[PDB]
Design a binder for this molecule. Structure first.
Ligand SMILES: CCCCCCCCCCCCCCCCCC(=O)OC[C@H](COP(=O)([O-])OCC(O)COP(=O)([O-])OC[C@@H](COC(=O)CCCCCCCCCCCCCCCCC)OC(=O)CCCCCCCCCCCCCCCCC)OC(=O)CCCCCCCCCCCCCCCCC
Ligand SMILES: CCCCCCCCCCCCCCCCCC(=O)OC[C@H](COP(=O)([O-])OCC(O)COP(=O)([O-])OC[C@@H](COC(=O)CCCCCCCCCCCCCCCCC)OC(=O)CCCCCCCCCCCCCCCCC)OC(=O)CCCCCCCCCCCCCCCCC
Ligand SMILES: CCCCCCCCCCCCCCCCCC(=O)OC[C@H](COP(=O)([O-])OCC[N+](C)(C)C)OC(=O)CCCCCCCCCCCCCCCCC
Ligand SMILES: CCCCCCCCCCCCCCCCCC(=O)OC[C@H](COP(=O)(O)OCCN)OC(=O)CCCCCCCCCCCCCCCCC
Ligand SMILES: CCCCCCCCCCCCCCCCCC(=O)OC[C@H](COP(=O)(O)OCCN)OC(=O)CCCCCCCCCCCCCCCCC
Ligand SMILES: CCCCCCCCCCCCCCCCCC(=O)OC[C@H](COP(=O)(O)OCCN)OC(=O)CCCCCCCCCCCCCCCCC
Ligand SMILES: CCCCCCCCCCCCCCCCCC(=O)OC[C@H](COP(=O)(O)OCCN)OC(=O)CCCCCCCCCCCCCCCCC
Ligand code: HEC
Ligand code: HEM
Ligand code: HEM
Ligand code: HEM
Ligand code: FES
Lengths: 32, 56, 65, 239, 51, 98, 379, 74, 54, 54, 54
């Protein structure tokens, strides 16, 4: 049942830089 | 990005953070005092002592 | 020397509120004067007139000064 | 009974960030010097406070030097006269407080060091009371030596009419009309009650700008730290 | 509140009345002694000479 | 009828707007913690999650959507049978005390 | 081997009292006032000390010394008016804190509630003795009236009043002892506030919903430190606006007149934060009854944990109780205004009705209404 | 009262995100204004009436003082 | 204390007609918004040059 | 510290204010002193730990 | 009072006029000396029995 655990969609809160799921996070961590 | 450069040049270290804050306050005190005094003198132009010292 | 305060009083006594306060004031005046032994004083209507006139006067005056 | 509240005059310093017109302060000090100081007294302010407000240092020291002031014990214990200095408070016209009443009808002239800040209404009162003298209405007789003033509580003042047109000559040369004299002396009295008025307004401007800067930033910090909790998404999965 | 009273509480009250009354007497004597309450002290024999 | 007034008060109270039920809002007096402790496991878990969600909502000053409100006829008094027993036991202890 | 924060004794106390204290996750902005009062207290002490270093508590020099402070001491006027308006802010926050406690059923904390009542009484006493120090007309005559109030108590009466006066009436001795009591009292207030926090911490805090928040506690430091800092910044905004734009907004002008005992000012009213009591004073014709009602108005807060009958701790889910509470608040403002006004026909009857309503809502309307709500909600 | 023996939970999952990944003002005005309006609608019908009747009483008493104060024709 | 007529007046030794608050030989205010007459102090009257006054 | 150029009225008033406040700070510090002492217990004249004989 | 003009005299007023005032004044004056005697003896005790190890 642990596999059924899925994080809900947070895209309503995520900043503009970390919004796409295929763009990493390290490149914009410094800016944020 | 300019913000990223500012961060990982002068914000990462908390001691560098403190130095930045200290110098920023050093300049900000002068800038803010100058601006506020200039505005206040502009509002009351001709109504302060510094504007009438020349007459007497 | 002509005091601007007097001229402000003159032009500001024309306001119709001043007109009613003034006419009420003489309506107190002759009533108190004719009645010999009466304790009534026209200070009430006088104060009404003074308030009505002086609010207007405060609106004006300082511009001329 | 009844009292007439003073109308809200449009003072130069009425504004939220306005300052006393210091030229009018100088003229009002002139008025106090040659009109009010004769019978009225002012103590808490001194010639020293005049510098940097309405008179320059040379003018202030000349003003102090004009008057004569009693000093301490002499070489044998006498009360010798002395030309006043900048560190001297404004002389009191009557030596003992009762002597002021005795010289007058019996009512002592209140000190003006706080009369603007002590009378309910402020300058609008003190101004209007001067420019409010009128013949008493019919049916109310006033005692001999008393004067009718609607704005003064009780409508019976002990003032001889103090301010009338062409009473003094301003050094600047502005007309000496009674309204001008009253306005300038009222501004001077406001300065006397609140010397820090201009500085208070300046600091208030600084405070307004500083808070308009800080409050959004501190609110942003609060939102930043609380956003962990304001975006949490709970879930319940009982077996 | 009405949860009190009844059989058991009344004999508790009766048992503790003597001690409570003695404590009240203690308080009364301590009060009259502490403030030198005249009204009572012009009656007790030997202390009348204090005033 | 009185049930109309009861419905009106239920809607006016607003604890249904938070997804809560009547017994979820009762002040926890000395009897109440004992009553809660005796609750079965499933009811206790549901109660604690509901209260946690209510606190979450009130921290953001928000309410459940209109659909997910505990309707007055669906409200259940899960605590009431246990609270009655706790109160009765306390009354019996008090009566034996006097 | 272990963190100093939770191993050092003083650090341990500070940690489990301000850093790692579990607090409810949904406490509203009203709870912030609990911090503000404390900050106000410090702002009252730290500023107040700086007035004590140029104030001479002597009748011949008290008023002159205060004028010297405001006109000759470098930035002295800032300290003086900051102090006065900060006392006003202290009472504003105190009333809002009591309102929060009454509303969200906080008086179940009992010990904290009673300690709060004691703190409230001490603060009113402190402000009363404080107003006298400038030795103005209103200061002197308000002190005269409030002390003469105590003559109504039976038997001891005048002896107690003259004991407080240190003589036949208020004079130099009264001013000096008022200054000394005023200096000492705020430190007692600080110790009592420490006891208040100690009692509060054992049980946690009451969230707005009124339900136990043991399932949603969060660490204090990351969130509520910055939340209360924002609150303190807002309070500083309001206080600084008052000080730097209308310093004497909440202040009688006549206090700027040296106290002359031979002239009664036309109006004799206490500070704005005492009028609600003073109006109650004006309501009761009997002097002893007036004093008893005046003290009972504040003492009634002790009865609140006994007068709560609704099975819901908070008031968030109780509409009619909410309406009653807001009527009580409006009655409080009505009492304040009535106390401000003199005592004539339009105001006497209004004061009587306001006092009766103020007592009736607390003692009668609120409990019966709670019974009605419990019955209406099937319990 | 320290963390560890606060309460007992089971089967409760809390997802959360870093403060550095979210925007501190997410739809500040888009969603904030409707929420404030809803809260005002919920509270005003209970909070306003006592204050409005206080205003009526204040105005009535303030006007009552003057006419009792005013001159009586006699 | 608006310029009273001390030791004189149409009435007795007191008179203060600035306002409606006049006086009397015993000191009673004839009229006026004065709260009371000239204030009487508690005098434990033994006799002249023996009366106790505060 | 003088509040001027010598010991005068300003210095006297500041000294009075600090003399008033300071003993309360002393009280707080004494409470802290006792707090720190209690975590280890008092020391006996012999120096040896008195844990067995308390 | 805390004014240069009326400081010393005020103290005399405490000793000469206040009911049981000299006792309070000299109690303070000598209690300061007792405080310092006890303080010095406490410091000596700390030095002697090695209580400074805490
Ligand atoms: C638009 C029409 C007017 C709306 C505001 C008036 C009103 O009655 O709103 C009720 C409406 C419904 O009340 P609620 O949010 O259910 O209950 C209040 C919260 O529990 C507790 O309040 P909150 O934490 O939800 O919101 C805090 C709120 C209000 O904060 C406070 O009331 C506490 C501190 C300020 C006291 C009053 C200062 C004036 O802040 C502000 O209003 C803006 C900043 C004010 C200073 C900093 C706080 O609330 C609001 O609109 C915001 C709070 C009240 C504002 C006044
Ligand atoms: C009197 C003594 C001095 C004052 C004492 C103040 C004590 C409390 C200090 C902290 C505080 O304000 O807590 C309440 C409260 C805490 O919640 P929050 O951090 O605003 O977050 C929104 C809430 O979750 C509630 O969110 P929402 O459901 O209302 O919608 C989001 C948001 C959007 O709505 C608004 O912003 C309201 C419309 C104006 C824009 O609401 C607010 O921001 C409500 C507050 C008014 C702004 O903050 C405020 O009331 C903000 C103060 C005003 C903004 C900063 C200055 C500009
Ligand atoms: C009563 C007081 C007035 C009323 C209350 C309001 C008080 C003012 C507003 C609040 C100010 C809080 C402090 C400022 C913010 C802050 O530093 O938060 C700590 C923040 C919180 O964490 P942070 O993550 O924001 O910062 C640290 C992390 N780095 C370094 C990567 C940025 O920590 C720091 O700022 C640490 C460095 C502090 C350096 C200070 C230098 C001072 C130099 C001059 C002396
Ligand atoms: C400490 C943390 C902050 C507490 C709050 C500080 C005050 C409010 C802050 C927000 C507004 C600030 C506005 C501001 O600073 O404006 C400038 C003004 C001084 O302006 P000016 O007189 O022209 O001088 C400029 C050159 N110095 O500034 C001022 O006039 C300052 C504002 C008035 C005074 C308020 C003081 C409140 C805090 C007092 C702390 C005292 C600490 C003492 C410690 C012991 C000292 C021995
Ligand atoms: C508070 C306590 C009193 C503090 C002041 C002390 C003086 C006082 O008020 O009363 C002292 C009084 C002494 O005795 P006394 O009552 O004067 O005897 C003659 C009576 N006609 O003694 C008392 O009044 C004692 C009783 C005091 C408590 C009231 C009953
Ligand atoms: C004017 C009052 C302040 C402005 C905001 C309006 C307001 O107070 O609304 C009442 C508010 C409603 O929200 P809530 O606390 O959740 O109560 C149940 C709502 N269904 O509930 C509250 O705000 C309750 C706050 C109670 C304590 C502060 C108010 C009383 C102060 C007395 C002094
Ligand atoms: C004083 C005269 C009496 C006195 O102190 O005699 C010494 C006596 C020694 O006691 P004890 O330690 O039992 O002796 C063991 C011997 N094998 O007792 C002591 O040594 C105890 C006294 C010394 C330590 C206690 C503090 C007082 C010290 C003297 C004054 C301190 C203040 C000035 C100096 C700092
Ligand atoms: C000249 C520029 C002035 C100004 C601004 C004032 N006065 Fe006088 N004054 C005098 C007497 C006998 C009194 C007592 C009357 C009474 O108050 O019953 C006064 C009073 C005042 C006040 C107080 C009014 C109030 O509201 O209480 C004020 C503000 C005031 N004065 C201002 C006498 C004289 C006098 C000669 C005898 C002269 C000249 C002045 N005054 C001049 C002025
Ligand atoms: C409980 C917090 C306090 C309150 C509510 C309070 C209240 C007041 C008030 C209302 C005044 C009158 C101010 C005025 O009329 O101008 C005042 C003055 C004064 N207070 Fe306080 N005070 C507090 C704390 C303190 C403390 C701790 C001290 C001593 C350090 C102190 C010393 C003074 C002094 C010396 C004055 C006279 C200065 C003046 O004329 O304003 N106060 N206080
Ligand atoms: C000297 C002034 C006071 C100070 C400094 C003070 C301090 C505090 C603080 C810091 C809190 C925690 C924050 C909060 O819960 O709001 C608190 C809570 C509380 N105080 Fe006070 N308080 C004061 C006066 C009062 C008064 C007058 C009362 C009522 C009689 C009171 C009763 C309470 C209650 C019941 C709580 C718990 C509220 C809760 O957490 O839900 N306090 N106090
Ligand atoms: C404000 C004055 C002081 C107070 C009220 C105070 C209070 C106390 C008290 C009540 C004790 C426990 C009884 C005792 O062992 O004597 C104690 C212990 C102690 N105090 Fe102090 N103290 C004061 C000043 C000092 C000073 C000046 C020192 C030295 C720097 C000091 C160091 C100690 C030590 C080392 C102990 C432990 C002694 C032992 O355990 O045998 N204290 N203090
Ligand atoms: S001054 Fe004598 S009664 Fe008004």
């Amino acid at each position: 049942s642990h596999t059924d655990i899925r994080v809900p969609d947070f895209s309503d809160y995520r900043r503009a830089e970390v919004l796409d799921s295929t763009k990493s996070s390290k490149e914009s961590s410094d800016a944020r | 990005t300019l913000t990223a450069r500012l961060y990982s040049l002068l914000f990462r270290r908390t001691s560098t953070f403190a130095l930045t804050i200290a110098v920023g306050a050093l300049f900000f005190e002068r800038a803010f005092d100058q601006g506020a005094d200039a505005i206040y003198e502009h509002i009351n132009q001709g109504k302060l002592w510094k504007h009438i010292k020349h007459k007497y | 020397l002509v005091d601007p305060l007097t001229t402000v009083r003159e032009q500001c006594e024309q306001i119709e509120k001043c007109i009613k306060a003034r006419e009420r004031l003489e309506l107190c005046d002759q009533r108190v004067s004719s009645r010999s032994q009466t304790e009534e004083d026209c200070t009430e209507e006088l104060f009404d007139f003074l308030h009505a006139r002086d609010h207007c006067v405060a609106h004006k005056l300082f511009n001329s000064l | 009974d009844l009292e007439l509240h003073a109308p809200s005059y449009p003072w130069s310093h009425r504004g939220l960030l306005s300052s006393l017109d210091h030229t009018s302060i100088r003229r009002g000090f002139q008025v106090y010097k040659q009109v009010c100081s004769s019978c009225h007294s002012m103590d808490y302010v001194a010639y020293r406070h005049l510098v940097g407000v309405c008179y320059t240092e040379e003018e202030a020291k000349a003003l102090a030097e004009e008057v004569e002031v009693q000093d301490g014990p002499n070489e044998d214990g006498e009360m010798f006269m002395r030309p006043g200095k900048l560190s001297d408070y404004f002389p009191k016209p009557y030596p003992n407080p009762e002597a002021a009443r005795a010289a007058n009808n019996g009512a002592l002239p209140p000190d003006l060091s706080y009369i603007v800040r002590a009378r309910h209404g402020g300058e609008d009162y003190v101004f209007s009371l001067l420019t409010g003298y009128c013949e008493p209405p019919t049916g109310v007789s006033l005692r001999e030596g008393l004067y009718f003033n609607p704005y003064f509580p009780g409508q019976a003042i002990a003032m001889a009419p103090p301010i009338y047109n062409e009473v003094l000559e301003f050094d600047d040369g502005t007309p000496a009309t009674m309204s001008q004299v009253a306005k300038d002396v009222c501004t001077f009295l406001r300065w006397a009650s609140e010397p820090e008025h201009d500085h208070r307004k300046r600091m208030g401007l600084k405070m307004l700008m500083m808070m308009g800067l800080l409050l959004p930033l501190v609110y942003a910090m609060k939102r930043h730290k609380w956003s962990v909790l304001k975006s949490r998404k709970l879930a319940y999965r009982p077996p | 509140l009405s949860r009190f009273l009844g059989p058991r509480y009344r004999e508790l009250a009766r048992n503790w009345i003597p001690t409570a009354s003695m404590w009240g007497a203690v308080g009364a004597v301590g009060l009259v002694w502490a403030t030198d309450w005249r009204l009572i002290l012009d009656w007790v024999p030997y202390i009348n000479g204090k005033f | 009828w009185l049930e109309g007034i009861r419905k009106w008060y239920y809607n006016a109270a607003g604890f249904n707007k938070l997804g809560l039920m009547r017994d979820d809002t009762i002040y926890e007096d000395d009897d109440v913690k004992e009553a809660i402790r005796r609750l079965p496991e499933n009811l206790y878990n549901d109660r604690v999650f509901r209260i946690k969600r209510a606190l979450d909502l009130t921290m953001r000053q928000q309410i459940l959507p209109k659909e997910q409100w505990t309707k007055y006829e669906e409200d259940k008094f899960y605590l009431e049978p246990y609270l009655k027993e706790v109160i009765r036991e306390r009354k019996e202890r008090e009566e034996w005390a006097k | 081997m272990t963190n100093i924060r939770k191993s050092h004794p003083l650090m341990k106390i500070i940690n489990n009292a301000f850093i790692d204290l579990p607090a409810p996750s949904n406490i509203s902005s009203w709870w912030n006032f609990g911090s503000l009062l404390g900050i106000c207290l410090i702002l009252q002490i730290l500023t107040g000390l700086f007035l004590a270093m140029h104030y001479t508590s002597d009748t011949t020099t008290a008023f002159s010394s205060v004028t010297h402070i405001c006109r000759d001491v470098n930035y002295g006027w800032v300290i003086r008016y900051l102090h006065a308006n900060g006392a006003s802010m202290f009472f504003i926050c105190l009333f809002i804190h009591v309102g929060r406690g009454l509303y969200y059923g906080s008086y179940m904390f009992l010990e904290t509630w009673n300690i709060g009542v004691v703190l409230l009484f001490t603060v009113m006493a402190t402000a009363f003795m404080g107003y006298v120090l400038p030795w103005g007309q209103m200061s002197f005559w308000g002190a005269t009236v409030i002390t003469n109030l105590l003559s109504a108590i039976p038997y001891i009466g005048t002896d107690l009043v003259e004991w407080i006066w240190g003589g036949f009436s208020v004079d130099k001795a009264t001013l000096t002892r008022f200054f000394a009591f005023h200096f000492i009292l705020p430190f007692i207030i600080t110790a009592l506030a420490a006891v208040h926090l100690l009692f509060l911490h054992e049980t946690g805090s009451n969230n707005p919903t009124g339900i136990s928040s043991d399932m949603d506690k969060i660490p204090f430091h990351p969130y509520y430190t910055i939340k209360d800092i924002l609150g303190a910044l807002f309070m500083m905004l309001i206080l600084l606006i008052l000080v730097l734009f209308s310093p004497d907004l909440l202040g009688d002008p006549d206090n700027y007149t040296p106290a002359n005992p031979l002239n009664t000012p036309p109006h004799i009213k206490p500070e704005w934060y005492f009028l609600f009591a003073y109006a109650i004073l004006r309501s009761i014709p009997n002097k002893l009854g007036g004093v008893l009602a005046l003290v009972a108005s504040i003492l009634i807060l002790i009865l609140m944990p006994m007068l709560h009958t609704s099975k819901q701790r908070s008031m968030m889910f109780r509409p009619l109780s909410q309406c009653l509470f807001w009527m009580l608040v409006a009655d409080l403002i009505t009492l304040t205004w009535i106390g401000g006004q003199p005592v004539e026909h339009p105001f006497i009857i209004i004061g009587q009705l306001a006092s009766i309503l103020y007592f009736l809502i607390i003692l009668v309307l609120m409990p019966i209404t709670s019974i009605i709500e419990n019955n209406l909600l099937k319990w | 009262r320290e963390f560890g023996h606060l309460t007992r939970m089971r089967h409760v999952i809390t997802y959360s995100l870093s403060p550095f990944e979210q925007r501190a003002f997410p739809h500040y005005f888009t969603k904030g204004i409707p929420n404030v309006l809803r809260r005002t609608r919920a509270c005003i019908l209970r909070v306003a009436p006592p204050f409005v009747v206080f205003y009526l009483v204040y105005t009535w008493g303030t006007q009552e003082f003057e006419k009792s104060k005013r001159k009586n024709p006699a | 204390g608006c310029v009273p007529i001390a030791n004189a007046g149409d009435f007795g030794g007191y008179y203060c007609p600035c306002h409606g608050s006049h006086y009397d030989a015993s000191g009673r205010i004839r009229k006026g918004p004065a709260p009371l007459n000239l204030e009487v102090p508690t005098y434990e009257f033994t006799s002249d040059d023996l009366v106790i006054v505060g």
